[PDB]
Design an enzyme around this catalytic site. Sequence first.
Site, PDB file in Angstrom:
ATOM      1  N   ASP A 213      62.362 -99.572  14.658  1.00 26.83           N
ATOM      2  CA  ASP A 213      61.604 -98.497  15.282  1.00 26.83           C
ATOM      3  C   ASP A 213      60.073 -98.660  15.217  1.00 26.83           C
ATOM      4  O   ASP A 213      59.423 -98.375  14.229  1.00 26.83           O
ATOM      5  CB  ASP A 213      62.041 -97.241  14.538  1.00 26.83           C
ATOM      6  CG  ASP A 213      61.410 -95.955  15.073  1.00 26.83           C
ATOM      7  OD1 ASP A 213      60.515 -95.999  15.919  1.00 26.83           O
ATOM      8  OD2 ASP A 213      61.821 -94.890  14.636  1.00 26.83           O
ATOM      9  N   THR A 214      59.463 -99.037  16.330  1.00 24.90           N
ATOM     10  CA  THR A 214      58.017 -99.195  16.254  1.00 24.90           C
ATOM     11  C   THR A 214      57.184 -97.934  16.101  1.00 24.90           C
ATOM     12  O   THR A 214      56.014 -97.957  15.754  1.00 24.90           O
ATOM     13  CB  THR A 214      57.545 -99.931  17.479  1.00 24.90           C
ATOM     14  OG1 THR A 214      57.915 -99.150  18.628  1.00 24.90           O
ATOM     15  CG2 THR A 214      58.192-101.319  17.540  1.00 24.90           C
ATOM     16  N   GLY A 215      57.846 -96.802  16.350  1.00 31.70           N
ATOM     17  CA  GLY A 215      57.189 -95.485  16.173  1.00 31.70           C
ATOM     18  C   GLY A 215      57.306 -94.888  14.757  1.00 31.70           C
ATOM     19  O   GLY A 215      56.888 -93.779  14.460  1.00 31.70           O
TER      20      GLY A 215
HETATM   21  C1  LIG Z   1      65.101 -92.257  15.324  1.00 29.42           C
HETATM   22  C2  LIG Z   1      65.265 -90.750  15.495  1.00 29.42           C
HETATM   23  C3  LIG Z   1      64.965 -89.957  14.236  1.00 29.42           C
HETATM   24  S1  LIG Z   1      67.038 -90.474  15.765  1.00 29.42           S
HETATM   25  C4  LIG Z   1      66.781 -89.343  17.156  1.00 29.42           C
HETATM   26  C5  LIG Z   1      67.456 -89.959  18.377  1.00 29.42           C
HETATM   27  C6  LIG Z   1      68.992 -90.109  18.133  1.00 29.42           C
HETATM   28  O1  LIG Z   1      69.591 -91.158  18.308  1.00 29.42           O
HETATM   29  N1  LIG Z   1      69.736 -89.082  17.758  1.00 29.42           N
HETATM   30  C7  LIG Z   1      69.526 -87.655  17.399  1.00 29.42           C
HETATM   31  C8  LIG Z   1      69.542 -86.712  18.577  1.00 29.42           C
HETATM   32  C9  LIG Z   1      70.725 -86.076  18.907  1.00 29.42           C
HETATM   33  C10 LIG Z   1      70.782 -85.203  19.979  1.00 29.42           C
HETATM   34  C11 LIG Z   1      69.650 -85.000  20.740  1.00 29.42           C
HETATM   35  C12 LIG Z   1      68.468 -85.673  20.441  1.00 29.42           C
HETATM   36  C13 LIG Z   1      68.411 -86.500  19.339  1.00 29.42           C
HETATM   37  N2  LIG Z   1      67.076 -89.224  19.612  1.00 29.42           N
HETATM   38  C14 LIG Z   1      66.126 -89.625  20.436  1.00 29.42           C
HETATM   39  O2  LIG Z   1      65.722 -90.781  20.503  1.00 29.42           O
HETATM   40  C15 LIG Z   1      65.567 -88.451  21.263  1.00 29.42           C
HETATM   41  C16 LIG Z   1      64.069 -88.322  21.070  1.00 29.42           C
HETATM   42  C17 LIG Z   1      63.164 -88.732  22.046  1.00 29.42           C
HETATM   43  C18 LIG Z   1      61.815 -88.710  21.766  1.00 29.42           C
HETATM   44  C19 LIG Z   1      61.360 -88.277  20.544  1.00 29.42           C
HETATM   45  C20 LIG Z   1      62.247 -87.850  19.590  1.00 29.42           C
HETATM   46  C21 LIG Z   1      63.590 -87.864  19.852  1.00 29.42           C
HETATM   47  N3  LIG Z   1      65.365 -89.153  17.309  1.00 29.42           N
HETATM   48  C22 LIG Z   1      64.581 -90.239  16.783  1.00 29.42           C
HETATM   49  C23 LIG Z   1      63.109 -89.918  16.673  1.00 29.42           C
HETATM   50  O3  LIG Z   1      62.673 -88.804  16.483  1.00 29.42           O
HETATM   51  N4  LIG Z   1      62.319 -90.980  16.774  1.00 29.42           N
HETATM   52  C24 LIG Z   1      60.896 -90.896  16.385  1.00 29.42           C
HETATM   53  C25 LIG Z   1      59.992 -90.396  17.513  1.00 29.42           C
HETATM   54  C26 LIG Z   1      58.649 -89.885  17.005  1.00 29.42           C
HETATM   55  C27 LIG Z   1      57.533 -90.696  16.884  1.00 29.42           C
HETATM   56  C28 LIG Z   1      56.325 -90.171  16.485  1.00 29.42           C
HETATM   57  C29 LIG Z   1      56.216 -88.838  16.202  1.00 29.42           C
HETATM   58  C30 LIG Z   1      57.308 -88.026  16.295  1.00 29.42           C
HETATM   59  C31 LIG Z   1      58.517 -88.548  16.686  1.00 29.42           C
HETATM   60  C32 LIG Z   1      60.365 -92.209  15.791  1.00 29.42           C
HETATM   61  O4  LIG Z   1      60.966 -93.251  16.497  1.00 29.42           O
HETATM   62  C33 LIG Z   1      60.560 -92.309  14.286  1.00 29.42           C
HETATM   63  C34 LIG Z   1      59.763 -91.187  13.665  1.00 29.42           C
HETATM   64  O5  LIG Z   1      60.316 -90.231  13.146  1.00 29.42           O
HETATM   65  N5  LIG Z   1      58.454 -91.302  13.816  1.00 29.42           N
HETATM   66  C35 LIG Z   1      57.510 -90.359  13.227  1.00 29.42           C
HETATM   67  C36 LIG Z   1      57.353 -90.710  11.780  1.00 29.42           C
HETATM   68  N6  LIG Z   1      58.401 -91.067  11.031  1.00 29.42           N
HETATM   69  C37 LIG Z   1      57.887 -91.445   9.825  1.00 29.42           C
HETATM   70  C38 LIG Z   1      56.428 -91.243   9.913  1.00 29.42           C
HETATM   71  N7  LIG Z   1      56.159 -90.784  11.173  1.00 29.42           N
HETATM   72  C39 LIG Z   1      55.623 -91.518   8.835  1.00 29.42           C
HETATM   73  C40 LIG Z   1      56.238 -91.996   7.701  1.00 29.42           C
HETATM   74  C41 LIG Z   1      57.611 -92.219   7.628  1.00 29.42           C
HETATM   75  C42 LIG Z   1      58.455 -91.948   8.680  1.00 29.42           C
END
Ligand SMILES: *[C]C1(*)(*)([C](*)*)S[C]([C](C(=O)[N][C]C2=[C][C]=[C][C]=[C]2)N(*)[C@](*)(=O(*)*)[C@@](*)(*)C2(*)(*)(*)(*)=[C@](*)(*)C(*)=[C]C(*)=[C@@]2(*)*)[N@@](*)(*)[C@@]1(*)C(*)(*)(*)(*)(=O(*)*)N(*)(*)(*)C(*)(*)(*)(*)([C@@](*)(*)C1=C(*)[C@@](*)(*)=[C@@](*)(*)[C]=C1*)C(*)(*)(*)(*)([O])[C@@](*)(*)C(*)(*)(*)(*)(*)(=O*)[N@](*)(*)C(*)(*)(*)C1(*)(*)=[N@@](*)(*)C2(*)(*)(*)=C(*)(*)(*)([N@@]1(*)*)C(*)(*)(*)(*)=[C@](*)(*)C(*)=C2*
Lengths: 99, 99
Positions: free
Chosen positions: A25-27
């Site tokens: 997960d690059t986020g």
């Molecule tokens: C990976 C996760 C936690 S798992 C979720 C998904 C699935 O597969 N399942 C559950 C559900 C069921 C029914 C309905 C809905 C859901 N889903 C999806 O993909 C939907 C959406 C779209 C857009 C947004 C949200 C959701 N979920 C997911 C998530 O949450 N992811 C996240 C996003 C964000 C970014 C930034 C801000 C806020 C949110 C990411 O990729 C991972 C995270 O959580 N990021 C934040 C953070 N974490 C941590 C920090 N920051 C610092 C330190 C450690 C950890």
Amino acid sequence: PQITLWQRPLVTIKIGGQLKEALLDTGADDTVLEEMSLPGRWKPKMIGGIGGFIKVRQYDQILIEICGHKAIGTVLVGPTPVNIIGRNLLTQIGCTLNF
Amino acid sequence: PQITLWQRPLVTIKIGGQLKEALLDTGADDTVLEEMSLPGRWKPKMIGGIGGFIKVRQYDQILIEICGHKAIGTVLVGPTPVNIIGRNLLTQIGCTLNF
Ligand SMILES: *[C]C1(*)(*)([C](*)*)S[C]([C](C(=O)[N][C]C2=[C][C]=[C][C]=[C]2)N(*)[C@](*)(=O(*)*)[C@@](*)(*)C2(*)(*)(*)(*)=[C@](*)(*)C(*)=[C]C(*)=[C@@]2(*)*)[N@@](*)(*)[C@@]1(*)C(*)(*)(*)(*)(=O(*)*)N(*)(*)(*)C(*)(*)(*)(*)([C@@](*)(*)C1=C(*)[C@@](*)(*)=[C@@](*)(*)[C]=C1*)C(*)(*)(*)(*)([O])[C@@](*)(*)C(*)(*)(*)(*)(*)(=O*)[N@](*)(*)C(*)(*)(*)C1(*)(*)=[N@@](*)(*)C2(*)(*)(*)=C(*)(*)(*)([N@@]1(*)*)C(*)(*)(*)(*)=[C@](*)(*)C(*)=C2*
């Protein structure tokens, strides 16, 4: 490998003897595993996201293996809906984002 | 481009003649933008994250350009901490994960 994002980028990790599935997960800044038992001392932490914050235990210097690649770093353990590999270990296995 | 993950993968997007910043997020299935005004009718959607579920608005067929690549598709609007580009639009600009 090269991974497409038509499906979720899930992989097998080995984490102290156990095999798990996890999300690349690059986020995510950090790696967060579902509730489990790890060796060591830990610190409480709060992490937040969509939907708000959760309390996690912070463990340091855990060896994880991500597709063959082993990596070391901080692992958070808590009530996450899925196992998540975040940027902290993605960097260690040389993961990049390409277009 | 190739993006590394030592820092957050923030890019500039353009929507409605505005520039905004957004996170490229392979852990997000869909694209979620902070509260704003879009063209057209919306429908309701619920999304779950790390902390819980939120209720969002779903607008169809929106054009975004992301890094000079333009995409047309579904965007959700709601209370997210950051604008998020999720997999529905990451596939349209040809983004892959590599290691
Ligand atoms: C990976 C996760 C936690 S798992 C979720 C998904 C699935 O597969 N399942 C559950 C559900 C069921 C029914 C309905 C809905 C859901 N889903 C999806 O993909 C939907 C959406 C779209 C857009 C947004 C949200 C959701 N979920 C997911 C998530 O949450 N992811 C996240 C996003 C964000 C970014 C930034 C801000 C806020 C949110 C990411 O990729 C991972 C995270 O959580 N990021 C934040 C953070 N974490 C941590 C920090 N920051 C610092 C330190 C450690 C950890």
